[PDB]
Amino acid sequence: AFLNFTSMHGVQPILKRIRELSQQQLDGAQVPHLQWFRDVAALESPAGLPLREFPFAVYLITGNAGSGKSTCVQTINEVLDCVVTGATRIAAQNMYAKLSGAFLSRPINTIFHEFGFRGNHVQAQLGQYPYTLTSNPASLEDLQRRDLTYYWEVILDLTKRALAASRNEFRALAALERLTRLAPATHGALPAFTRSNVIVIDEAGLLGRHLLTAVVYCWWMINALYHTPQYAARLRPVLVCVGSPTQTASLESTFEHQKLRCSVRQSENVLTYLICNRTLREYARLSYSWAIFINNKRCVEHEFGNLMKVLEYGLPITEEHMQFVDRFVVPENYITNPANLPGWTRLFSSHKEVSAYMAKLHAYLKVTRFVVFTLPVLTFVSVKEFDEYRRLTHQPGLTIEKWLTANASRITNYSQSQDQDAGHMRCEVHSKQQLVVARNDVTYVLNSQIAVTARLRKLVFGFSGTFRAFEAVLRDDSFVKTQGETSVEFAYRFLSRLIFSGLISFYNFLQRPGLDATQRTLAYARMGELTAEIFYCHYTPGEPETTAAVHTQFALLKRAFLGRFRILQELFGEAFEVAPFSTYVDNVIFRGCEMLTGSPRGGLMSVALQTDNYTLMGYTYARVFAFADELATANVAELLEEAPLPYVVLRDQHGFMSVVNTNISEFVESIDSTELAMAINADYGISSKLAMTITRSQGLSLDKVAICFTPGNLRLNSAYVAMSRTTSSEFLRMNLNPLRERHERDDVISEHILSALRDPNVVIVY
Amino acid sequence: PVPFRRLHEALGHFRRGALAAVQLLFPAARVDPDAYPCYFFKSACPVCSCTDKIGLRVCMPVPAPYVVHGSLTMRGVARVIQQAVLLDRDFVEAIGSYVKNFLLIDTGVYAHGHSLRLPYFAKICGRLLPVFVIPPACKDVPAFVAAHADPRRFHFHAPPTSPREIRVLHSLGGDYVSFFERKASRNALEHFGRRETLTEVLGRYNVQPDAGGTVEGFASELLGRIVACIETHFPEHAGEYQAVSVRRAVSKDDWVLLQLVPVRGTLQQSLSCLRFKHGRASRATARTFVALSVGANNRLCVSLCQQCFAAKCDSNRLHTLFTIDA
Amino acid sequence: PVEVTALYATDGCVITSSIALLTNSLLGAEPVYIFSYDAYTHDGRADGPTEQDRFEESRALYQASGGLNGDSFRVTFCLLGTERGRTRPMFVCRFERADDVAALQDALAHGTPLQPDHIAATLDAEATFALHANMILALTVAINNGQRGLTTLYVHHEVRVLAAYRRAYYGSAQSPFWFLSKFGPDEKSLVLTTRYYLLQAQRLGGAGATYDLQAIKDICATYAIPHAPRPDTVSAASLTSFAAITRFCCTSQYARGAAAAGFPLYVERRIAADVRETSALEKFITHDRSCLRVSDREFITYIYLAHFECFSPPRLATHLRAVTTHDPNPAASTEQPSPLGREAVEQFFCHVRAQLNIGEYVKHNVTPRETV
DNA sequence: TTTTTTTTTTTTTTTTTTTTTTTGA
Numbered sequence A: 001a002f003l004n005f006t007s008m009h010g011v012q013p014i015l016k017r018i019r020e021l022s023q024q025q026l027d028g029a030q031v032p033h034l035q036w037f038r039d040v041a042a043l044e045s046p047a048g049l050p051l052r053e054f055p056f057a058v059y060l061i062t063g064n065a066g067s068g069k070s071t072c073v074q075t076i077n078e079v080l081d082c083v084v085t086g087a088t089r090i091a092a093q094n095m096y097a098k099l100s101g102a103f104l105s106r107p108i109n110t111i112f113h114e115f116g117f118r119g120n121h122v123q124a125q126l127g128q129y130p131y132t133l134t135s136n137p138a139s140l141e142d143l144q145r146r147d148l149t150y151y152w153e154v155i156l157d158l159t160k161r162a163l164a165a166s167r168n169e170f171r172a173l174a175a176l177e178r179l180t181r182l183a184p185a186t187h188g189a190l191p192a193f194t195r196s197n198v199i200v201i202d203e204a205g206l207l208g209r210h211l212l213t214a215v216v217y218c219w220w221m222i223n224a225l226y227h228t229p230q231y232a233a234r235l236r237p238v239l240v241c242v243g244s245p246t247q248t249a250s251l252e253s254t255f256e257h258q259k260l261r262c263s264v265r266q267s268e269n270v271l272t273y274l275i276c277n278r279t280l281r282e283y284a285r286l287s288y289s290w291a292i293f294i295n296n297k298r299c300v301e302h303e304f305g306n307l308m309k310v311l312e313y314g315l316p317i318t319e320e321h322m323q324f325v326d327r328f329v330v331p332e333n334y335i336t337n338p339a340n341l342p343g344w345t346r347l348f349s350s351h352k353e354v355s356a357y358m359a360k361l362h363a364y365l366k367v368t369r370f371v372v373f374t375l376p377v378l379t380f381v382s383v384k385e386f387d388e389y390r391r392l393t394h395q396p397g398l399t400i401e402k403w404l405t406a407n408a409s410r411i412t413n414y415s416q417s418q419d420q421d422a423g424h425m426r427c428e429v430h431s432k433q434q435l436v437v438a439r440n441d442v443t444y445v446l447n448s449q450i451a452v453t454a455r456l457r458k459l460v461f462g463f464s465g466t467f468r469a470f471e472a473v474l475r476d477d478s479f480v481k482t483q484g485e486t487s488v489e490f491a492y493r494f495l496s497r498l499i500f501s502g503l504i505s506f507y508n509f510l511q512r513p514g515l516d517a518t519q520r521t522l523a524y525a526r527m528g529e530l531t532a533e534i535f536y537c538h539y540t541p542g543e544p545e546t547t548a549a550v551h552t553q554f555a556l557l558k559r560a561f562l563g564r565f566r567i568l569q570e571l572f573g574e575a576f577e578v579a580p581f582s583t584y585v586d587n588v589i590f591r592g593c594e595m596l597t598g599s600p601r602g603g604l605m606s607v608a609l610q611t612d613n614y615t616l617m618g619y620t621y622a623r624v625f626a627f628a629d630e631l632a633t634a635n636v637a638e639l640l641e642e643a644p645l646p647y648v649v650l651r652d653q654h655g656f657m658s659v660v661n662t663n664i665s666e667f668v669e670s671i672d673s674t675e676l677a678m679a680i681n682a683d684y685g686i687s688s689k690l691a692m693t694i695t696r697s698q699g700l701s702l703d704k705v706a707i708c709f710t711p712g713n714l715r716l717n718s719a720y721v722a723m724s725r726t727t728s729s730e731f732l733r734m735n736l737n738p739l740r741e742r743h744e745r746d747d748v749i750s751e752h753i754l755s756a757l758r759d760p761n762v763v764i765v766y
Numbered sequence B: 001p002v003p004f005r006r007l008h009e010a011l012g013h014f015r016r017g018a019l020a021a022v023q024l025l026f027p028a029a030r031v032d033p034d035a036y037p038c039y040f041f042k043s044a045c046p047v048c049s050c051t052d053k054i055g056l057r058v059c060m061p062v063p064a065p066y067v068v069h070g071s072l073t074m075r076g077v078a079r080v081i082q083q084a085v086l087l088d089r090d091f092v093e094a095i096g097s098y099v100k101n102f103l104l105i106d107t108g109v110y111a112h113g114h115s116l117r118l119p120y121f122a123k124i125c126g127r128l129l130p131v132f133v134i135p136p137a138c139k140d141v142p143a144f145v146a147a148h149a150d151p152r153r154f155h156f157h158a159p160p161t162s163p164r165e166i167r168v169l170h171s172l173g174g175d176y177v178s179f180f181e182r183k184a185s186r187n188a189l190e191h192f193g194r195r196e197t198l199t200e201v202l203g204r205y206n207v208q209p210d211a212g213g214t215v216e217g218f219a220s221e222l223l224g225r226i227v228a229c230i231e232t233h234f235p236e237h238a239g240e241y242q243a244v245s246v247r248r249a250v251s252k253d254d255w256v257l258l259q260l261v262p263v264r265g266t267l268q269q270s271l272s273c274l275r276f277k278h279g280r281a282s283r284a285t286a287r288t289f290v291a292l293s294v295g296a297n298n299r300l301c302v303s304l305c306q307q308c309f310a311a312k313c314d315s316n317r318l319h320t321l322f323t324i325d326a
Numbered sequence C: 001p002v003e004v005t006a007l008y009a010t011d012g013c014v015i016t017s018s019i020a021l022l023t024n025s026l027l028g029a030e031p032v033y034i035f036s037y038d039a040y041t042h043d044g045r046a047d048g049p050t051e052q053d054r055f056e057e058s059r060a061l062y063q064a065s066g067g068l069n070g071d072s073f074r075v076t077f078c079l080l081g082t083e084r085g086r087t088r089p090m091f092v093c094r095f096e097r098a099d100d101v102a103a104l105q106d107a108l109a110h111g112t113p114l115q116p117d118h119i120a121a122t123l124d125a126e127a128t129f130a131l132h133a134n135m136i137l138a139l140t141v142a143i144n145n146g147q148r149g150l151t152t153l154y155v156h157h158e159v160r161v162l163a164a165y166r167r168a169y170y171g172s173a174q175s176p177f178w179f180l181s182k183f184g185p186d187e188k189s190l191v192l193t194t195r196y197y198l199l200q201a202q203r204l205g206g207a208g209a210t211y212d213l214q215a216i217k218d219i220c221a222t223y224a225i226p227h228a229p230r231p232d233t234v235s236a237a238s239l240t241s242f243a244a245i246t247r248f249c250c251t252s253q254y255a256r257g258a259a260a261a262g263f264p265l266y267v268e269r270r271i272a273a274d275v276r277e278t279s280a281l282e283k284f285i286t287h288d289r290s291c292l293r294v295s296d297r298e299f300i301t302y303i304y305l306a307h308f309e310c311f312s313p314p315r316l317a318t319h320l321r322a323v324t325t326h327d328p329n330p331a332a333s334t335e336q337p338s339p340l341g342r343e344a345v346e347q348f349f350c351h352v353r354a355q356l357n358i359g360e361y362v363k364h365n366v367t368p369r370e371t372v
Numbered sequence D: 001t002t003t004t005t006t007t008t009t010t011t012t013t014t015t016t017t018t019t020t021t022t023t024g025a
């Protein structure tokens, strides 16, 4: 209870600064006019673009990752007007989890959705036009023009789409006597940037510098077309950027269309841009607008903490540190051997290394004999696409397999796409629908804690747990809360159906060894006594579309099971509670990996969450029209009807089985400024969470970690990121000692935090 | 880059602060801080065309009747002067806007066998030449100027310039005794627990390092476990440490490093480096050590370490390969 | 003229039922359940109110026997919503007739739901439909592209009316279990924290207006007034619908007397005592940080050491035990002066003189060995 | 003996509802 105290009393100065930062009116002339964004649309190339200042404010919340910086965000949300966003979908869901654990937070989306990022922008040439900054000292106008030229192929499209959409909106209400506060409510589906000027971007170090200006730019857009009351009040955006500046980095990928060499360079993140740019540190006044959270809560060690301090603050590496980290070094052939460290996540510094490691363990488990099962993943290229693109690349000679030499990464979610063991691509022309299709096999493991990568639609088919676990679900109605408060009737219908379907399970437990004849006699006798105040008999299920029905018909079934669970719980003591209770709406038989959910009826249709830790179960086919929302896309929809698409089944933390949909992703990049839908990749998009790259590890914390370090490529920032993903130093093993080997340390942002920790106007929260 | 006048004023402030520190360190002396001669030399880099550093050397006569003895004693004198010059508001006000790191004095040039570049000499890029900061009440200016040219004024063990009494300051403060460090260490024990020293932990496994060859007593039985580890995880050099004798080399109070030189096969047969596979001769140019330390919940951690003489591995740097429990 | 701020939640969708109540339509109107309420009277003195004056006035307001003490009651019902205000009013009702106040005392001291008749016959149409009149106008303008107007807009486009009344008053009804979840498992929290954080924080102003729900729950946890047993021995977790939470809160003894009167004052007192010590400690922290001029490693050692030495778990526990109360009366409070800052200054911030152009750090470990 | 070439994130609009089983040469 005393843990929150420091945050509780130190976030108040933060709150008492963001308020004046958000309630500061700009001069009339400094407000970006609508005509500005009209001219931006007219401009074709980002060269004649006029030097235009877009005013903004910042407030920086830095601090160790997992330093509980979210308490500050929590206090901000419940006190201030704010639009909470996230740099990654995982981070956005993590903030939602930690904001709805205290009060109500509206669905937290990504900043990309907030400024209008759509599908076609994903693969867009974001680094093309040049800029010779008339700078040193770099004017803010020049920096903003650089960040708009960087994102010309995104800023221009956003401006054009927003502008050419037409005017009503707030313009209408404002003239009530010529009430815009009640305008976003009455006029719905309006962009969330029209109702607040405090934009919280969490884990903002995962965003490049180009985005910062972009966000501000977009803010003004969405407040100019709609003529928001904030625009009439001459308010300016304030970007509360929350993230770890020394545990997070942003990378830019460019693909050269002749060499087929996809390159990824390092970039300046928003945090580093704001901390280390003399122009932004003055305009935004970071000295009076910086909060550093300094405590590592999860950590409960002492020497582990000192090492984190020296690595994060750039302190000199001493002999004692070398001797401490010496106790973690385990051989190269010990980490890579799958027989060792079971259940420990293994980090490598190369995607090829992860592709090697995942394959060897697959062989190990398969030979030793979970189940190493094989599941189809396909691809769909088209003849016209690879005809025209080959024409435009100045090289019309290129084989399709050579097309898939590197664009397989750039055809779907990169993370799992380049970190999966898979077969040989069977690229066969299926031009029936004018197409050429590929076919490989992404072997998984059976019954492992896998994670959903992309956005999937979960369809819960039932619960495979214990009688006690299902009694708990009904008692607290936790399941109902996961579906949201606006549509509770749908959640109550399916639970009702389950209870009327799971009555047979009690009768199987009736056949349990070690029970007296009269013990079972009293069992069935109390079953009869409860039927007297209720045997399945012939209960009439179902209800009309009425709110009262799901609070009367369900109320009976909820009380029926609750009682029934608790009834036999007392009769058989702990044995009944631990007994496995499986409830499904259909005859579900699961021999080996293959499952069979018969014919679905879409009793409860929901959306799987990426953060939710699921468990791989098996690939039932049971073609559901719920996932078959297929409408190019129809040409492959016909083939998906042809070849039965397998729907992989996952088990959530509670234990409810959920059948999910597949994933489809486009590749559109070109060089002739002709973005055309080339290839759509149909696969599963699940990750093992057992092996990954250090760079991706930055995003999410891990329980047990074994780090495989490649010598020569040793960057102390990578070592710090890898070693900081786990709370306890006890469960940490490593290839070599990053402190004892030659390491390229880049301690430039470290001294900047140190000078920030050495400034009277910077607020440090313990 | 800095203007010379600001530098000269900062040097006057440095003279003031250093003389206060000297009159504090040597209490029975008489240092009038307006006549006591301090000598200054700057490295050539008017406009001080300094892009890297302003190389300075400050020479002070040790006031009579004192003589300082010991490397650590002058280390302490340097720390006192350094933390005394960053107290005078004039110095920090003058040079503070220019110094990126406020640390000015290096205290590692006083160990036995460590060299310091003399004034009136260059570096193989800057000939240290005097910069004259006359004492505010110097009664002989020409003498002060023609005092920078006398080697005695800039030599560590110069002849002191009819001695009745002489006071030898041969010891001052210790090392790692900062109040922040001593308070943090004490709070660590209160909140987290006692981490027993290496000697105490080794004493549990019947090792009393007071006598010679006692640590080798445990290193013997430890060799079998280490060899079993290597001939499983690192097999491509297996039959190399079958017969080796632990040779105690380095002894820190939390780090015992015993070399593993062999006799069998050849007396000088070098132990092939376990990592970074090299040629027949390049690989067999490495040394191996065993490191006993205290770790985890006070359990003796044994590490295998190597020192390779090849370019691929850090040359003459100690590396670790596996740490096993004991 | 006693004014009550009341948070309610009907059986189902409270928004639809409330709108139907405003339209005087007998189609959907679940009886109203009131489960948190703040009663206040306009202070007739310019600057007369003191802490004990406020405590006496409040203890008079919340009748110890049960209910309030006024003759006429203007009750402003509210929902969890945002305009940052934590609630939002929906409808206001006058209670001047004997039958009106009899129903209000019954529903305020016990928890029996207020039937649609009692409210519907007492809407202050001069102000009730005035609260949401601008929403009516905005809906008219939007759909184009008082009470008769509300009914007409109800008929014309139902979807947009419901969406507007759910975006505004955003939280509306969340769940019976949500309140028991986010406002502590204890009865003290469930009554007092729900009263303060929702219906008492922003109205009374003060620092507590800017404090979060977890902070307010912590303050309630240290508001450790004596605890009498529950006459029906009903546990706080035995509550399923709002008819149970409302009954728990209304017949509680943290709701109609001294504790209900001392909690708002204790929030202010605790924060004042805490900030007095913390702000002093941060003044020392910031000053020493700004003038340290030490090596990078020793700087980090100081900053972490100081934050520990002032805000360690033991020191914090002693401080929170020094602000815990055993009685709500401010003149009979058992809270005593906190030792946090004085202890922190005595041990660690007493060595600031060592780094004040004294050389006392040397004197601590000087060992001046000059052999003659 | 040179000798490489490492890592990431974003891509929405909703919650139900028409079933088919010999093919080849």
Ligand SMILES: Cc1nc(N(C)C(=O)Cc2ccc(-c3ccccn3)cc2)sc1S(N)(=O)=O
Residues within 6 Å of the ligand: A064, A294, A295, A296, A299, A302, A305, A306, A308, A309, A312, B183, B184, B185, B187, B188, B189, B191, B192, C301, C304, C305, C308
């Ligand atoms: C031993 C004693 N007990 C005090 N505690 C509880 C602490 O430091 C606790 C802590 C403080 C910071 C971190 C951290 C984590 C990530 C990166 C940097 N830092 C971890 C843990 S302080 C130390 S002391 N007095 O040696 O400085």
Ligand SMILES: [Zn+2]
Residues within 6 Å of the ligand: B273, B274, B275, B276, B286, B307, B308, B309, B310, B313
């Ligand atoms: Zn080597």
